[PDB]
Design a protein around this ligand. Structure first.
Ligand SMILES: O=c1ccn([C@@H]2O[C@H](COP(=O)(O)OP(=O)(O)O[C@H]3O[C@H](CO)[C@H](O)[C@H](O)[C@H]3O)[C@@H](O)[C@H]2O)c(=O)[nH]1
Ligand SMILES: O=c1ccn([C@@H]2O[C@H](COP(=O)(O)OP(=O)(O)O[C@H]3O[C@H](CO)[C@H](O)[C@H](O)[C@H]3O)[C@@H](O)[C@H]2O)c(=O)[nH]1
Ligand SMILES: [Mn+2]
Ligand SMILES: [Mn+2]
Lengths: 296, 296
């Protein structure tokens, strides 16, 4: 459930928070609109697990595996079993044009998987963009009655470390690993005023990654419907945003600030970026792929 | 309103958040359960004001002025007019045994004051403790229909600097200025197991002050009803907590973690504690009083 009567926490023994010691001295841990930025060292997972288990929380995880991307599912789901919301109720929603090709992955107790058959668009850009419409369409079909939160991710990924209830909040985005240290003018927002995703050079908080966003079902429905409607306006005007759904996600989260922001621990590419000191954990990472080959 | 459809923020020009620069290097700015700890330098008030004005937010402020404490009202209310939620809708609720003695303070537009007549208990301890019952009783009489958030404060105080929408959240407490740097064993929690307010030596996050707490009307109703019911159990068992309502507030907020914590900028005593470097602003401060004299 979300927003229901909360019972009391049990007695717990844990280290006292240190008011006069910053939890991180190297990174920003709260946005200017008072949303936590989630890094290792900012949270006590024992306290959070108690809070969310007492609310009987169910987390949905959406993933699209269309055309050749079915190949990514086995590692994605295996590693999600090891690292994603372990101990909590989970419902995986695998959207695919090939149900027969979803691997039989053994799930832990309290975890379930549904296969949702959808059409396959020809262009990879359209496959990626139409996720917003598809997630929105399923936010009445299933999600509102089945889960409390939705987490929406790319499939060409693997979990390597804990991803848990510390992410859960009404609306979150994730810092894209290529831009967390960049100035806003260097962010690859859409810069053409003719697109609904347009963001001027002097605006922007962060560059959020298309590959990991989420929130309550209500907030995810809002986000995905808004991004889809914006993409349909652009299509009618003969323009396609520079980074497709990611461009529209960024416009939405500029104008509707997230209530948590995930650090790049939650969206990383070790091949391209290594393992910087500022990353104490690499939680959810890109898997190698010949992009051109696998998209066609 | 709270929790209603939020429109989009307008374009705004402000400094980019710095992911690789902490906003404070000297203090903890987020609790281990991911609640912001509100210090100067953690928030951009322009962004927050937009968010809360677009939701048409109304803030109630409760204050008790019973017996001789009517003397504190003029400065309290004058200074609240200069510093408290300016630009937002405010409803002051002055609880008193002497309506005739409430000063005629000129209010800004969009701000109103109601006088609520209540009984005066003999012992100052009872006056202080019975605020929980009284706030709870008024959470159906008025607050649910009149305000979005409630802020509940001591009257023997003055505002010296901004106290605004950065505090607003479902449930908040405030770090007591005498204990923010103290170890939990030094916190003056109730330590007798016979009291409902009992907290063992190895438990506790913070020592919250009785003089400044709040949240949504729903959460404040929960807190104040729980503290009152706990105080009635103690009374039936012939025990009175060491710091009265503050002891019960601390037990409640240990077991029901606040969604923001206010720094001691929001609850200070300059006579007793000076102006430490760690306090960039002194927002809400004790006024001098001969405690014994004014309480009897
Ligand atoms: O044939 C395809 C193409 C794409 N996808 C789905 O679409 C997602 C995004 O496509 P890629 O992973 O191929 O592309 P990138 O990793 O470059 O994607 C990044 O840029 C995209 C926009 O160009 C999106 O915003 C995406 O979320 C972001 O991680 C995939 O993970 C997969 O879930 C398929 O299922 N099949
Ligand atoms: O004759 C009285 C006595 C008290 N009060 C009200 O009760 C509040 C609390 O009493 P004091 O301010 O006299 O006491 P302290 O500042 O020592 O209070 C601190 O300790 C108290 C418990 O002992 C409460 O928790 C309180 O919120 C906390 O700031 C006052 O501000 C006032 O609002 C009156 O109105 N009249
Ligand atoms: Mn990808
Ligand atoms: Mn006081």
């Amino acid at each position: 459930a979300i927003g229901e009567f909360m019972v009391s926490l049990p007695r717990m023994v844990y280290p006292q928070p240190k008011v006069l010691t910053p939890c991180r001295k190297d990174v920003l841990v709260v946005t200017p609109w008072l949303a936590p930025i989630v890094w290792e060292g900012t949270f006590n997972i024992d306290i959070l697990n108690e809070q969310f288990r007492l609310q009987n929380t169910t987390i949905g995880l959406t993933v699209f595996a269309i055309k050749k991307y079915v190949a990514f599912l086995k590692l994605f789901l295996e590693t999600a079993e090891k690292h994603f919301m372990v101990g909590h109720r989970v419902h995986y929603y695998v959207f695919t044009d090939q149900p027969a090709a979803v691997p039989r992955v053994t799930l832990g107790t309290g975890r379930q998987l549904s296969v949702l058959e959808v059409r396959a668009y020809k262009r990879w850009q359209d496959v990626s963009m139409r996720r917003m419409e598809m997630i929105s369409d399923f936010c009445e079909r299933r999600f509102l009655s089945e889960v409390d939160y939705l987490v929406c991710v790319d499939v060409d990924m693997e979990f390597r470390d804990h991803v848990g209830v510390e992410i859960l909040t009404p609306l979150f985005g994730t810092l894209h690993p290529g831009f967390y240290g960049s100035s806003r003018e260097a962010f690859t927002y859409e810069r053409r005023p003719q697109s609904q995703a347009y963001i001027p050079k002097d605006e922007g908080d962060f560059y959020y990654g298309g590959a990991f966003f989420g929130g309550s079902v209500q907030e995810v429905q809002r986000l995905t419907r808004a991004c889809h409607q914006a993409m349909m306006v652009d299509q009618a005007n003969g323009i396609e945003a520079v980074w497709h759904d990611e461009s529209h996600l960024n416009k939405y989260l500029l104008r509707h600030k997230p209530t948590k922001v995930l650090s790049p621990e939650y969206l990383w590419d070790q091949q391209l970026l290594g393992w910087p000191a500022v990353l104490r954990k690499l939680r959810f990472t890109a898997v190698p792929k010949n992009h051109q080959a696998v998209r066609n």
